[PDB]
Amino acid sequence: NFNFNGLTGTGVLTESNKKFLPFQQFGRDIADTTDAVRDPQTLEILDITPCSFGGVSVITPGTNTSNQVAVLYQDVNCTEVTGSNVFQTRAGCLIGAEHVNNSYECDIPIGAGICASYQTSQSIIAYTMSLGAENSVAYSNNSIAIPTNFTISVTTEILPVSMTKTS
Amino acid sequence: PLSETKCTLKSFTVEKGIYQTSNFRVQPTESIVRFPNITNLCPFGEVFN
Amino acid sequence: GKIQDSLSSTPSALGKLQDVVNQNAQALNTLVKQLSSNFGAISSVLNDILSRLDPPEAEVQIDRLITGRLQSLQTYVTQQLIRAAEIRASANLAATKMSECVLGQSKRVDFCGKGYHLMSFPQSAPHGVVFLHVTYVPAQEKNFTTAPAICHDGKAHFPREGVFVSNGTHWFVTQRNFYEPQIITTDNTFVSGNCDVVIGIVNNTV
Amino acid sequence: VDCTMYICGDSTECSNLLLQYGSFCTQLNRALTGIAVEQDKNTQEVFAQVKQIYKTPPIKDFGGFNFSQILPDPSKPSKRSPIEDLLFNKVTKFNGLTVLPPLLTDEMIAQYTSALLAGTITSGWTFGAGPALQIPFPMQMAYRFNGIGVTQNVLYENQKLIANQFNSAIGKIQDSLSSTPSALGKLQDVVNQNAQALNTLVKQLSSNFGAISSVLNDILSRLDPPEAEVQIDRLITGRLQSLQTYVTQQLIRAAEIRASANLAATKMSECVLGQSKRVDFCGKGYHLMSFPQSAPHGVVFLHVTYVPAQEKNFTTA
Numbered sequence: 001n002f003n004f005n006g007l008t009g010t011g012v013l014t015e016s017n018k019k020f021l022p023f024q025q026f027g028r029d030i031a032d033t034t035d036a037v038r039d040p041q042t043l044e045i046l047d048i049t050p051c052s053f054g055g056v057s058v059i060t061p062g063t064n065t066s067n068q069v070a071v072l073y074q075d076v077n078c079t080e081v082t083g084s085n086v087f088q089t090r091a092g093c094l095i096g097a098e099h100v101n102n103s104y105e106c107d108i109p110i111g112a113g114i115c116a117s118y119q120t121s122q123s124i125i126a127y128t129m130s131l132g133a134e135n136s137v138a139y140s141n142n143s144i145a146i147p148t149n150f151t152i153s154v155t156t157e158i159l160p161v162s163m164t165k166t167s
Numbered sequence: 168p169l170s171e172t173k174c175t176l177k178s179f180t181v182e183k184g185i186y187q188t189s190n191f192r193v194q195p196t197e198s199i200v201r202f203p204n205i206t207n208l209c210p211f212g213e214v215f216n
Numbered sequence: 217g218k219i220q221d222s223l224s225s226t227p228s229a230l231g232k233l234q235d236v237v238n239q240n241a242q243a244l245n246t247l248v249k250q251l252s253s254n255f256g257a258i259s260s261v262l263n264d265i266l267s268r269l270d271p272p273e274a275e276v277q278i279d280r281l282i283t284g285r286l287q288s289l290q291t292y293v294t295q296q297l298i299r300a301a302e303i304r305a306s307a308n309l310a311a312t313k314m315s316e317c318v319l320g321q322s323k324r325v326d327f328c329g330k331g332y333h334l335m336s337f338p339q340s341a342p343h344g345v346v347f348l349h350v351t352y353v354p355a356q357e358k359n360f361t362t363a364p365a366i367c368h369d370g371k372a373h374f375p376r377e378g379v380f381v382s383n384g385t386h387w388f389v390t391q392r393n394f395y396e397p398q399i400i401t402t403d404n405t406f407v408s409g410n411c412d413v414v415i416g417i418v419n420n421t422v
Numbered sequence: 423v424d425c426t427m428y429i430c431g432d433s434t435e436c437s438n439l440l441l442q443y444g445s446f447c448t449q450l451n452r453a454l455t456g457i458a459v460e461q462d463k464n465t466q467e468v469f470a471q472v473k474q475i476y477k478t479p480p481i482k483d484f485g486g487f488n489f490s491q492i493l494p495d496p497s498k499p500s501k502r503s504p505i506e507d508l509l510f511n512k513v514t515k516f517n518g519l520t521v522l523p524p525l526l527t528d529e530m531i532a533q534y535t536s537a538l539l540a541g542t543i544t545s546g547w548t549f550g551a552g553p554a555l556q557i558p559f560p561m562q563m564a565y566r567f568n569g570i571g572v573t574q575n576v577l578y579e580n581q582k583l584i585a586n587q588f589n590s591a592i593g594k595i596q597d598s599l600s601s602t603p604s605a606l607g608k609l610q611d612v613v614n615q616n617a618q619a620l621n622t623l624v625k626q627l628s629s630n631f632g633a634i635s636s637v638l639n640d641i642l643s644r645l646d647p648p649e650a651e652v653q654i655d656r657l658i659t660g661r662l663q664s665l666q667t668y669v670t671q672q673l674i675r676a677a678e679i680r681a682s683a684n685l686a687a688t689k690m691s692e693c694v695l696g697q698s699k700r701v702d703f704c705g706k707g708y709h710l711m712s713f714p715q716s717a718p719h720g721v722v723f724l725h726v727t728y729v730p731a732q733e734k735n736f737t738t739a
């Protein structure tokens with residue numbers, strides 16, 4: 001908890017990454033929010049990092065498969081949040097999970113290119129998003145593919161038309 | 168966490184997916200009280216004595 | 217068959233509509249669940265307020281419960297109007313697809329699904345419309361040696377229709393959407409420029 | 423927005439009082455989540471026009487066309503094309519306001535975009551369905567002109583003009599994007615409107631809405647609890663109204679953005695992957711081709727058209 005010459009709020013201090021002009025004690029971010037404070041006794045400046053926070057979500061297989069799940073704690077350290085399978089990424093902490101450096105198509109997002117799925121024991125594993133198989137189709141300026149064998153496919157779509165006539 | 172999911176969904180069947188069950192916050196454990204130099208003499212020091 | 221089998225065995229396949237109806241049902245159930253909130257008032261039930269407080273005091277709490285209920289409805293109605301705008305756009309799209317895919321053959325790329333639109337059929341749904349979109353999609357193709365034109369007596373003959381392709385020994389005309397080799401004839405070509413003008417021009421008697 | 427954080431500033435007494443108003447902001451936490459989901463769905467509708475990511479050939483046999491000025495540069499720390507960089511680098515907390523990441527990042531968008539560019543450059547319109555096909559770029563052009571009612575004879579007579587005029591136009595586009603800030607306005611306004619709306623939610627936290635204090639926690643320590651409850655309810659009401667107003671405006675904007683992105687998706691099907699004959703649909707002239715590029719918060723197109731330049735009037739019948 002902080003109180004700097006009457007200024008209050010919460011956060012974590014770290015050595016400042018910015019200089020202040022001699023005019024000021026309090027530096028600010030967009031929409032007038034305190035970013036850093038020059039210490040009232042010592043002529044040094046510290047940045048105030050907000051105490052980390054975020055939502056908590058559970059990455060789970062269906063219950064028709066298994067009861068093995070992992071929990072994602074957004075924007076925090078695993079040291080602040082705990083079983084044996086603990087994985088730390090930039091998006092958050094995963095408990096009941098591991099990580100692989102390969103990319104795959106995925107069902108569950110973590111965010112910023114980071115995926116999750118239930119895979120082989122079958123822990124939740126953090127993965128990179130693949131964007132599908134890479135179709136490195138060859139091309140040439142002397143060759144044309146001409147369809148010979150065609151099929152008729154039928155697909156579906158359901159569109160909204162009307163809502164409940166609520167009174 | 169699976170029970171957290173069942174209680175957020177109000178379901179005993181959970182489909183494969185991501186569910187929002189809670190909110191995690193880092194809480195303060197200590198405090199920092201910082202004030203200006205008390206070397207700048209206050210006039211009570213002149214009124215008294 | 218595959219569509220009916222999928223829709224009946226994979227409930228999420230019906231999700232395109234389940235979300236619409238579930239969101240509307242939830243919005244109405246939400247208006248009902250919210251009635252137990254007192255919105256910070258001394259009691260959640262206006263009839264309790266009236267029996268509990270003398271009228272000059274009841275009026276403060278009466279107005280507070282009403283305002284809270286009013287705001288919940290204002291949010292609901294506002295969202296419903298926004299949804300109505302989106303639903304109307306959907307209804308207009310459904311009408312468009314009937315014109316483009318059901319009673320005609322749209323060439324809009326992948327408009328009613330991947331491929332050319334051959335036909336389509338509507339079905340009813342609570343709160344919506346269901347379509348079966350029938351499309352024509354390539355399965356297998358052969359990559360032929362090609363040229364923009366065929367050279368005949370020094371002139372450049374372009375297809376009047378289609379493209380000139382080759383199987384390794386002979387040149388012929390095929391269409392972009394079907395392999396059906398035609399013999400090159402003067403009645404199947406247009407001449408413009410010559411055999412030096414067309415890059416990659418090849419020899420095949422017209 | 424964590425509305426309990428925005429309103430309380432981590433106060434225990436506040437949390438117990440927030441519950442008194444029930445779900446007035448709880449429903450907005452739901453609406454904001456819903457908006458973020460809709461914005462992801464919209465990103466997929468406009469960019470996922472290719473079933474799986476596809477790649478360009480290793481050899482850029484593009485007929486003299488400078489498509490490399492459109493396609494992302496793989497050698498850089500940021501795999502963007504000159505067009506993507508000109509828009510990207512020009513277009514622009516403890517209060518409970520955070521921003522969620524996309525799953526599909528700008529670089530990954532550029533990677534799907536590269537697949538679409540690979541498609542229209544070396545497969546042509548047929549890329550849209552069935553296995554991707556291969557068509558020589560020069561022959562795709564003969565088709566693209568016939569596809570708009572223009573004889574292919576123009577390609578053979580004016581092969582150099584066609585590559586040069588296209589390349590000239592692309593260079594002019596890059597010069598405009600880099601020198602005329604208003605050229606980027608179509609997106610710069612979008613990012614500013616959302617940034618301003620959020621900066622407004624933060625700036626307004628300092629308002630007391632006529633309450634004894636703008637700081638909830640100050641009200642709580644200043645007044646005995648039963649008096650604090652009244653002033654706190656007043657401050658909270660103003661804070662709740664602010665986020666509710668914000669959300670409604672964002673829901674409306676989300677609908678308009680989807681309509682624009684759906685239009686972008688349509689143009690992709692009609693100009694990027696096809697030859698629309700619609701008058702002025704992707705700009706004046708007939709549509710021969712088009713190329714997508716990524717953008718922060720948006721989609722960018724280079725719409726390539728056949729436009730008559732000079733004419734003469736003949737006696738007719």
Ligand SMILES: *[C@@H]1O[C@H](CO)[C@@H](O[C@@H]2O[C@H](CO)[C@@H](O[C@@H]3O[C@H](CO)[C@@H](O)[C@H](O)[C@@H]3O)[C@H](O)[C@H]2NC(C)=O)[C@H](O)[C@H]1NC(C)=O
Pocket residue numbers: 041042043204206
């Ligand atoms: C305000 O009062 C404080 C309390 O004395 C004064 O701050 C102190 O400043 C001295 C002189 O710079 C610091 O001493 C130095 O310590 C460092 C390492 O700690 C050492 O390397 C130097 O040789 C020197 O001894 C001291 O750290 C610092 N203390 C605090 C608590 O801030 C300050 O001088 C006063 N300001 C005035 C009178 O204007």
Ligand SMILES: *[C@@H]1O[C@H](CO)[C@@H](O)[C@H](O)[C@H]1NC(C)=O
Pocket residue numbers: 211212213215216
């Ligand atoms: C006055 O002098 C007395 C005697 O030393 C001392 O106790 C007191 O603190 C002094 N007051 C001030 C204001 O200096």
